[PDB]
Amino acid sequence: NISLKSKTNGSVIKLSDVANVEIGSQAYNFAILENGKPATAAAIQLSPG
Amino acid sequence: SISDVNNAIRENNVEIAPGRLGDLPAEKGQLITIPLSAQGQLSSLEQFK
Secondary structure, three states: EEEEEEOOOOOEEEHHHHHOOOOOOOOOOOOOOEEEEEOOOOOOOOOOO | OOHHHHHHOOOOOOOOOOOOOOOOOOOOOOOOEEEEEOOOOOHHHHHOO
């Protein structure tokens, strides 16, 4: 719903009109698949001693 | 003034960061991905002059 000002005509337009907003990933470089399906992982390091 | 010369140097000599064609996220059916390179810095006395 953010509002921008159009220079061509001066009308008020919304950010959605000129772009698509969504919730995604900061980076798309890597992907993890568990048996061919989306997955995530975390490695646990043993504490010394 | 000196600030004008500094601004001219800054704008004319700048580092560009071109991305990639087909960079993730990528449209379906994309078969070729190739990096992009652009040299925005000046490398000679004549260029600065």
